[PDB]
Structures are given as structure tokens and as C-alpha cells.
Design a protein around this nucleic acid. Sequence first.
RNA 1: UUAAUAGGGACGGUCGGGGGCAUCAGUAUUCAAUUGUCAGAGGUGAAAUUCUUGGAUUUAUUGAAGACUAACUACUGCGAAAGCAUUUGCCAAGGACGUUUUCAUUAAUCAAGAACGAAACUAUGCCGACUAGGGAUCGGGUGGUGUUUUUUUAAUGACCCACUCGGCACCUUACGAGAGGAGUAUGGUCGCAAGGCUGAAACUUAAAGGAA
Lengths: 124, 61, 141, 210, 119
Amino acid sequence: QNDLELQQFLRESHLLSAFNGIVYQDDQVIGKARSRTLEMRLNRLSRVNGHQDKINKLEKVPMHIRRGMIDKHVKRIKKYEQEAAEGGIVLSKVKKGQFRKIESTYKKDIERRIGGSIKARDKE
Amino acid sequence: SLLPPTDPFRRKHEQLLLDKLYAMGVLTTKSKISDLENKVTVSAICRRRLPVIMHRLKMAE
Amino acid sequence: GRMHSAGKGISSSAIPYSRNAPAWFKLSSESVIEQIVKYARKGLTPSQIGVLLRDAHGVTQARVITGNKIMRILKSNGLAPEIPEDLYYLIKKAVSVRKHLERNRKDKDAKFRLILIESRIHRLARYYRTVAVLPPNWKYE
Amino acid sequence: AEESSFMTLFPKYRESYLKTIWNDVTRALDKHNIACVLDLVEGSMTVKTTRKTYDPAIILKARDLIKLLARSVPFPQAVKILQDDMACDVIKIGNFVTNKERFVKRRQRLVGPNGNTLKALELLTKCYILVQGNTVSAMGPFKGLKEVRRVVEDCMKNIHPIYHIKELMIKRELAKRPELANEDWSRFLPMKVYTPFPPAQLPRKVDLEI
Amino acid sequence: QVFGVARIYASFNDTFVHVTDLSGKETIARVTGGMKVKADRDESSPYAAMLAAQDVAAKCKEVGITAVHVKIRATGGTRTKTPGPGGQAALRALARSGLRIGRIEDVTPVPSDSTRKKG
RNA sequence: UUAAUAGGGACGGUCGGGGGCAUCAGUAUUCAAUUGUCAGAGGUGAAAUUCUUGGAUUUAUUGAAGACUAACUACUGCGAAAGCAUUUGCCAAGGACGUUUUCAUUAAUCAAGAACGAAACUAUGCCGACUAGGGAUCGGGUGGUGUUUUUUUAAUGACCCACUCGGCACCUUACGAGAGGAGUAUGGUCGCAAGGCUGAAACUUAAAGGAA
Ligand SMILES: [Mg+2]
Ligand SMILES: [Mg+2]
Ligand SMILES: [Mg+2]
Ligand SMILES: [Mg+2]
Ligand SMILES: [Mg+2]
Ligand SMILES: [Mg+2]
Ligand SMILES: [Mg+2]
Ligand SMILES: [Mg+2]
Ligand SMILES: [Mg+2]
Ligand SMILES: [Mg+2]
Ligand SMILES: [Mg+2]
């Protein structure tokens, strides 16, 4: 549990697969995988002491675009969950508000735009 | 930047680019590699034009 | 609302609103009474008697047709059970389970049910003793 | 030269997806001179050899392909089964434990939080793994399949897969150093009598008065 | 055409190529990958299976058989139900050697109920 | 006196992988008996260990022993929970439904007491005395309809739609007083610790080593 290299590899496995033996070592990893790996690490460390508003900020997007982006992404998740439900596939648990992190989330960098969840709905 | 940080090739080329740009005068300092993005600007190149350097040397008002 | 169970069934009979005999019923009130007496003499319980009369003789309800319940009709002519019918059946279900447990000593499930059946007997036996329908000294087995 | 044929039924929900990709499936199998049939009335997929079939063992791989497609495997991943190196395996997991809650927790352990454990195992073993119901479906090279079975079975026996993920990471590094090839790697790896009749019931207070 | 039965047992660590008469009582030629290689790591390789298949094919032609029925199997039991790499390679080699293949079937032992403890 | 959309019991066709005692089958594992052939077979990342020309592994026929009940297997069923998956019979038990059958308040919640009863390891769901719903599904019942079905031997279902009671869950909705973390510094206390080649000190001392 306290092994940094092992825990880092597991959390970052989704990015490494998307932007790909497997080059998980820091010296071997190159390209977008390096940039996305470094950003994820720094965000993880910052979350402990930095204020929630300042540490994470969604990139500015117009409303008609972001609501469209969220709607299409939600439809993709529903199809992914329904298809697994119709089959026997077991899926990782997700909290109620949060969006499930499908493969498209990592490749398309959707989270930086739409965010993990709708903060307004979480607040109420 | 996307090359691994300990790569000998990455460090060599980044220093060479810093070496060259400082010599031209586009870059004021050689210390920080991030300057290649933040402090590389058209104004930096324009600031080395002959009329501007005359102004800074006080050859013209 | 089942006791000793989690069931919530509501199946039951819906006694009709009107308390008069049906118009289509055209049999004498007395003749029903002799019909009741014969069945009890043969050995049927009051619940069984009502079913036969209702199923085959058009007796919707003995009280409605005759003005008195089957239990009072039988008692009026000397026919009365030694113990109430509901307690009468509960004791046998305990006896049958106890007989089964004697041969099957590893049936732990039957042991659990015998507790529920016996506990129901104690609650019912308590009630009748309170009303004096059952003699106070009476105890189950 | 009689034709060898294999048939596999598929669920109705997969009818829509199979219909779209059938031209791709036909094209992929046509390269090996294997004929295929998709019956949407009976809900079955059939693969058969033709007179131009020259590879005797390809029909077996085509049978595995239709099996994978019926089990909700995407075609781009399923089509790789036609390669010589690739293989498919199914690991039963329902028989290891008798408590339902323990079974679910151990199965969820295999997937891990956010799928991290499953994705890491796929990356290290180079296998496509799908955990479904009481079986674990794996597709990939033979060396990878053997490793996947050990982790999945050990997971059902209360050995956390994270230990196997760490063990797989170290083993790959060890394999790349020649001096220790002959040496064992164990040092470097992480380590009264029952009564049938119930007792009587205590009388209530009202019973005592009676 | 005289027909035999080529019983292939493709394990992860080895491959058996065994040809027998139709009854199966009379063994004709049994060759293993370990017989055809110098290292234990290479017994299960497709190369070792191919060498075994050709030698069996040559022996079968000497006896008189010209065709065979293939019965490939894996370890089965409570272990994997999938044949190893050698089984596929051996099957291809037999066709290349010139023996006609009659019929192919999977006869891996599939237990109805494994001897595995639930506790 | 009513006969609670309180409770108990009765009867009718049912439902269940509920329980107990026997019984049947199955492929697999292990062993054994014969059976063809000959140098390897299992296992590992490599090995070591184990079996083996007295025939291993493997092939075919046959027998026995213990365990188990694959695929069908489902966000399905039963059970108070723990738990329960082959066939057939017996023993009692149970749920819901149907009843114009019966007792007539016999009830609810319950500290005490009574019965049954290696492992964890990333999770999480506002709560309630609380409204109206949607789809799917399990068991029962009523009605409609027309396809499977079939005919004076007996039995006599499956599917589709509508209603309704009771369940396992899912997605939604109206209402409600429900009354320390992360660090930094240390003239204190208690511990751990530096060094100078070894031999080698009372001996400027051998051989052999270390360094170079
Ligand atoms: Mg009532
Ligand atoms: Mg009842
Ligand atoms: Mg009944
Ligand atoms: Mg039964
Ligand atoms: Mg039974
Ligand atoms: Mg047996
Ligand atoms: Mg059994
Ligand atoms: Mg069932
Ligand atoms: Mg239940
Ligand atoms: Mg079965
Ligand atoms: Mg309902």
C-alpha cells in the first residue's frame, strides 16, 4: 500500500494503455503519456493542502458546447454500462454523482472540460 | 519536454537552444528552460532590431 | 402482518354489505338446521360444515339464512366441541411435528417450527382460559 | 473431403452489433478460405471449411472467433484470435467460495478500484481480460494466459492480486538481467448434547394469576 | 485409404503426437517435443511439435496408413481446457507431410463437477 | 352487535435449487487389473525435488474409493439467519393467492431468557410515521382473444393482452424539528553514533592481506 512505484503504475494504467512490453518507467515513458502522467501526479499531491476551488479549474467553454459535450459523454457511459449489464461484465463501482471514467475519458481529455461531476447538483 | 527528463539528448539540445537564443539577444537569461515557452515572444525579437537598440544605447531620443 | 413470519398477505373473504338472505334462496330455515346437525353428527367441524352448505346448498352464510351462527346452532342441540376449533387443529400440527421429530432427530428445521407452533398454542390457550371457554387448570400436554 | 463446421448460439441483445460487423467478419475469414453464416432467426453463428481451405487448423481458430463474439468481445479484439500466437481461455471462479458476499468482494478485488487492477494485469500480461459472472475470460499469448490464471485463482483464495501485480513487475525486470537467469528469483520476490425437543416457555404474568 | 487416429495432447509444457489404429489399442508411433529438442524450455514451442509431427508422419506412411482422424485435447480436468501452441502446429505439419486428415474433434477431459473444495 | 384492506384457524389448486431419510446418474481425480509402443514425463521464468526400459508419460477395455453436482445459472427462486443447484419415493413443514367457510380482539414493540448459528484488504447509501409513478421479472387469481395444442382412454397445458394481491431488486418523484490535517525549529531529557590500514600491544614486531 505504501509502495509508490506500484501504486503509481496502477492509477496511471489507463493513461499508459491509451497512449501506448509496456513502458511504465519514468525514463522510458515518452510522448503524451509523460505529460498526462506528470499532471496527474502533481494534482494528486496538491489536493491535500490546496483549496478545492483553486487546485482544479475547468477550462472555459461556452454553455451550448459543454452541455452538448456532457450529454454525448453521458450517452456513451449509459451504452457502456447497459452493454455490460446485458452481458455479465462486472464494472468498477462509482459514486452516485461522479461520471464513470470510460476509455474515452482518458483519450479525449474530457475531464478537463466537463469535470468529474456537475458541481451545482452536488451542492444542492 | 516530452522526452524523458534524464535523457542526455534532451539536456544537450535544450542547452544549445538556450545558448543560441541568448547570444542573439532574444533571451535575457539562460538559467530556466521554461523561458523557451513563456519568454519567447515577437516583442523579444523586435526588441533586437537596430532602431530599438539605438534607442537603448541613447543614440536616438 | 403475519405473526412468526414476514408475509404481508391480505387474502380474505369479503362478507357482502347486505345482511338479509338472498332473494333467490327458497329453502326453509329449519331444514338448514337439520342439515347442520347431520353433518356435525357425522364428525365434521363447523368450518367444514359451512363450506359444504355454501358450496352445494346455497347457504351463503348460516347466520344470514338462519339468524344464528353454526356454533350456536350446534350447541343449541347438544353438539359442542371439547376445545375450540383453532386450538383443536394447532395441537395436532404440534403432535404430527413431534412424531416426525422422533424418527428424524437431525431435522433442526422441524425443531424451529415446533417452537413457533407451540408458542402459538400458549397464546391461544391463554386467551380461552381468560374467557373461561377452557378450564383454568388446562395445560398443553 | 467433408466440410468441418462449428456453430455457436448468441444472445438476442448481441444481434444488433453482430449484424453491423458481419461484413468485416466475412472479410477476415475469407482470407483463410473459411465460409461463415449468421442466422438471425435461430440466433447462431456458423463457420465451415470450403474446398479452398488449405490450413487444416484455421477452422478451430474461426470457431474460437465466433465464441468470443457471442460473449460480448469487440470484433477488433476478437479478430486477433486468428493469429497463431494468440489464444483464448475461460477461468471458472464460482466454485472457490460458498458465501455470496465473500464471492462478490473477491471478484470486485480482481477488477479493483476504477478498474486499475484489471487494466494493470492486462498491460503486464498483454492479455485482454473480461470478468463476467462466474467466469473470467482471457485472450492473449500463452505465457500471458498462464499468468492470468494464477492471479485469478489466487484472488479467489484470499491472495490480493496486487501482490501478483508487484510480482509480475519484478519478474520482468529480473528477466532482463542475464547474470541472475540461472539463479532462483525467490529471494527478490515479495513474500451439551443436541436435544430434538424445544424447552418449555416461561409463563406470562397473567398466566400466573390465572 | 487406410485410416488411423492421430491423438494430439497439447499441454502448455509439452506436446504429444500419437498415432494409433481406429480402435486405439495398437500404438503406431509416439513422438514428443521433448524428444526433438535439447532444452526443457523449448519442449512446448511450435517448432518442437512440428518436428514430432513429421517423424510420426514418416513412420505412418511406412506402416501403410495414408489418412488419420485428429483428436486434439488439452490437460483438461480442473486445469485449462485450451490446447497449447504445439497442438495447432502439429496439426498443420501433418497436412504438410502429406497425410490426409479425416476429422478434427476436441476431446479434452471436461469434468462435470471438479474435485475442488468450496471451503 | 359488527366481523377491522387487526389477528388466528379451516378448505381448494398450486409454488419453491426450504428441511430430514433412502435411492439413481454423471464426467472428472486417485488407485488397481490387463493392453500397444518406447525414453522421457510432470513442474519452473530457469531449476531443484518426484516417477521411469521391473515400462514412466501416453493409448484402449474394465473395476473400486472419496468428494462434487459444470454448461442451463439470471442484479432469478426458497429459507428467520447461517445457507440451499443430479433423478425418483417417503416424512412432516411453509409462503402467496382464491373463498358469500369459522373464533371474535385473542394484537404490536419488547431489556431478561430460550432455539439455530485463517479472516479482512477501497467501500458509501441522507433518514422517516412519508405521495404519485415507470419498465422488467417471480408466484396466485379473474376476464378477452386467437395461434400452438387436440379427437368419448385418462389427463389437459404454452404464448399474447387487460385487471388485481403478494415478493426480489432498478429508475424517478411530493412531504416531514429527524430536536483536527500538513509542517517547521530545537544550547532540555533519553537513546543511537565520528574517526584514525588489519595483524599490533606492555613489543614502532613476522607472515599473509587491504589501499595504491
Ligand atoms: Mg376480518
Ligand atoms: Mg395460514
Ligand atoms: Mg394447503
Ligand atoms: Mg418439494
Ligand atoms: Mg429435498
Ligand atoms: Mg460415487
Ligand atoms: Mg444434494
Ligand atoms: Mg429456479
Ligand atoms: Mg425470500
Ligand atoms: Mg447439473
Ligand atoms: Mg406489485
